Design a protein around this ligand. Sequence first.
Ligand code: ZN
Ligand code: ZN
Lengths: 400, 400
Amino acid sequence: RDHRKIGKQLDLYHMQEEAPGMVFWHNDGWTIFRELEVFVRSKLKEYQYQEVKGPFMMDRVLWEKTGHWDNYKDAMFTTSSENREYCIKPMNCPGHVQIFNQGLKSYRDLPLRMAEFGSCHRNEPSGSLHGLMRVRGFTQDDAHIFCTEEQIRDEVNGCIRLVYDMYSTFGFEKIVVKLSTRPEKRIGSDEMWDRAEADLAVALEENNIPFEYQLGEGAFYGPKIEFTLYDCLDRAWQCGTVQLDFSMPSRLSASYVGEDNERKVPVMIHRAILGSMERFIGILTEEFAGFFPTWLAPVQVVIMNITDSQSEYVNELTQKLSNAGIRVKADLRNEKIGFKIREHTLRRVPYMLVCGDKEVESGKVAVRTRRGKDLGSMDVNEVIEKLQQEIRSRSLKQLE
Amino acid sequence: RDHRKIGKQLDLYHMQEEAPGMVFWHNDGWTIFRELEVFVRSKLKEYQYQEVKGPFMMDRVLWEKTGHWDNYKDAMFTTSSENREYCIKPMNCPGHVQIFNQGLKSYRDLPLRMAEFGSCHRNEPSGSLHGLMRVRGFTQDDAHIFCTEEQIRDEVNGCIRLVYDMYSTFGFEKIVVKLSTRPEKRIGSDEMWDRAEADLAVALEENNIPFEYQLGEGAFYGPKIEFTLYDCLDRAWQCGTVQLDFSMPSRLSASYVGEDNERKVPVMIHRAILGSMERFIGILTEEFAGFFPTWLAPVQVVIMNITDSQSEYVNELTQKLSNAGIRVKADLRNEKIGFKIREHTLRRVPYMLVCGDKEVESGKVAVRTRRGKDLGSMDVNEVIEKLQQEIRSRSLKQLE
Ligand SMILES: [Zn+2]
Ligand SMILES: [Zn+2]
């Protein structure tokens, strides 16, 4: 149950000294990452998020306007070009504000949800690096919501429901929620902080989430909600974050025309559900010990023949399953059938399809799961539709 | 017919001085970019490429091993981390060799086709930057093929077929091809170069492609084939490149176990069809003058009502088209039908559905193209079928 060992065994990823804390995604690992992209994207459509893409580096002058340069300059990678300093972005927030600043915005346009699979880079200490979970380069399921003060409580409601929607997909039901209150050094009045913390507190009340305060741990520009999930080994993982911000939109001159025809600064909500997806894949690898759900598996079906008298029956069925959008491979090697099954059981392939002349004539397939249960011979069309339903529903459990 | 002018009008992207030569992709522009990813990935499956993902930056020590540091140090962004220097990758070639080096490779594993949507950054002179077409940060439809010397002809043939397959999708048929022979300073013997240039020359001759010798224009590590497509304005655009490399795999300790059990250094083919994806989108924007094909359009269908008595019929119809994988949005505003239709014609929306009392009862839609042609009132399921076929087939033309 160590993702670094399982990652090398299943040929998912590797890392090396020439790029500390940066991931070489192999084909199978990149398949798992891309499937997470689709799953998150399906949520963005349902929750009505835009998806954007910001550049990897911006002028250091811009990063000074945000106030983050004075705080986290050592964690930033800096480069030079024609006597100008550029910073590789460790966050997507200033970039999203820049998209927001293009073209006059009105209250008609709010709330405006803006998501990005933004690649961020942080100059993390090398001694702290560990596998997929403490890295220098990571992709964040990041989003930013621009809205009015009145729309804060409803927008946070969507973020809260989004958090439990996505976690329950992976089987994470034990979630601990903490709210961070105002720190010693902060901006804004006490009154503004009172309603900001109330909006987070109320939004958790309307969802029946019991939570717990983390006193003084909030950022200097707003309180936040942090979600912590517990794996099958009862290890806490802090993944979700909903962060209010009353500083950055004003620092970057973001504005909209309100109902009263006066110019107003919008409120920014920073939200991430999975946090670092490279880290999240590490959690999934150890939570499932490599036995990924069928929708996440790099190879979903392997079809084998007993002899060569079925090699192109396998070939036709491999094509037939491929046209169904199933990641399927064929194993026509001159090896014992037991040797082939142990080969792909070791690789954690969800389903093994075995074809003898018993099933070739009847147009059926013997089906075996990686766990070992033999489901007998069933119609190919019935097998394909069952496989589709499992993949489309992202079912945690296989057949029976 | 200016990609920059069309980009701002259709809200595709924007650029600013805070990140010169770098593109902020908006929601509509990022839809076009992601659709090209799907199209390219469709070709990768057909031609059996692996898709991997390399790190965004790597140690400058490795870049000195490749020999690229001596020649292209001025074009590389560099950063520091714990008294070590790292270069943001201007190319994906060393990263793919690192992935290939993990695990001993046999001759049975070749040809190894490895593709990546690599994000490369180059310190281009800011005075030369131009919109989407000369940029500092770009994404490349990149790939590298590892094979033996006997496999070069067959692999180059596949690259040539893929070049014309993808260009024909976008309506580019006039393509000019040039072969760059040996330069004054080069590695390897004459016989190696004689064989290498012959393989490129023979492959171009077999495919009956007229080609012009670019005498002395090849790289020092191998000859190359460059493809230039001509747009509807008869302007030349150099996009495709096929480079043979006999230096880097030996420099980076790449090897495989041959059928004679003697370890050999493989041959690398550097391959890109579209070149920079930002640049290709710019060419496509000017080629169509914003009238994107239905499969690339950010919004494919707009459904409108006549009065408020059909707002519900549009809403279910929009959802019904949405479930069919069609990018559809509803326009239920309180504006005249002529005002609505112009609003979405200016936005180059391919199709516009109109619902009065006549079609709500009959379960039909009045369908109009952005060219201005009325197609009458047809069945809802029939227009959904025809829309999917046009999207699935990537049709340049519309209905009729
Ligand atoms: Zn943020
Ligand atoms: Zn290359």
